[PDB]
Amino acid sequence: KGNHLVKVYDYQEDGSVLLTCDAEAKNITWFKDGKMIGFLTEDKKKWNLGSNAKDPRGMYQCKGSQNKSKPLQVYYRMCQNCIELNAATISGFLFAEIVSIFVLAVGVYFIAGQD
Template sequence: MKIPKHVIGVIILSFLFKDAVSEEPEIKLSGGKVTLYCKDAVTWFKDGKEVLYNKTDLDLGSETDDPRGMYECQDRSTKKHLQVYYRMCQSCIEFNTATISGLVIADVIATVLIAFAVYCVTSPDKGRSSQASDKQTLIRNEQLYQPLRDRDNSEYSHLSTARPRK
């Protein structure tokens, strides 16, 4: 079955005009500003209310202001819709590869320094000679028991007599 040439031409033209007719509004980001662009726009609407701005582009302001809403650009014949929900964290920190690797390296260095400090504090000193008390034997002549002191008649050297119980 052969397809007529005029049918192929109509299909090609419909694909070409499809992009031109149903072109949606675009969002442009430049210099921290959010801008909507609509080809051949005459009137802009935000959330159903007309915005007094009759150009092809609509400046939504800074991206840190979190612009959002339902925007429409309307020319004489068509109305094109675009929903904008822009969320920007104002107090966030941007992490890239260099920042993350710097944090990891700093963490490893801090851990090694703390481990070295703990080792220095807890290890015995090698340069210190043994003290005399370390070598002194408490029981001389390898006796099993240490002899008692000589008897002394001082106040605490003997047991007191027990008092009778009542």
């Protein structure tokens, strides 16, 4: 085993990542970056972090009566704020930029001329 009790079991249909601790004990307390931000587990052991779109990170320990578990890295790059910088997108972005500046420049030239 190697004392790597912490495991992850997620399901695709319901978007959420869940921490399952392979500890045969009750009132297991959780951790994050070596600090206690984990409630003691009664009945259901599956810790909840949230949705995968939130991109959870950090160390997650699992401490019970028997010392504590080994850390597990959770790294999520679930692209929510990712854009595609393909050929079309750069051209469209620059074109929108240029038309905006062109219109604003025409308006500013007119105000400068009048006032």
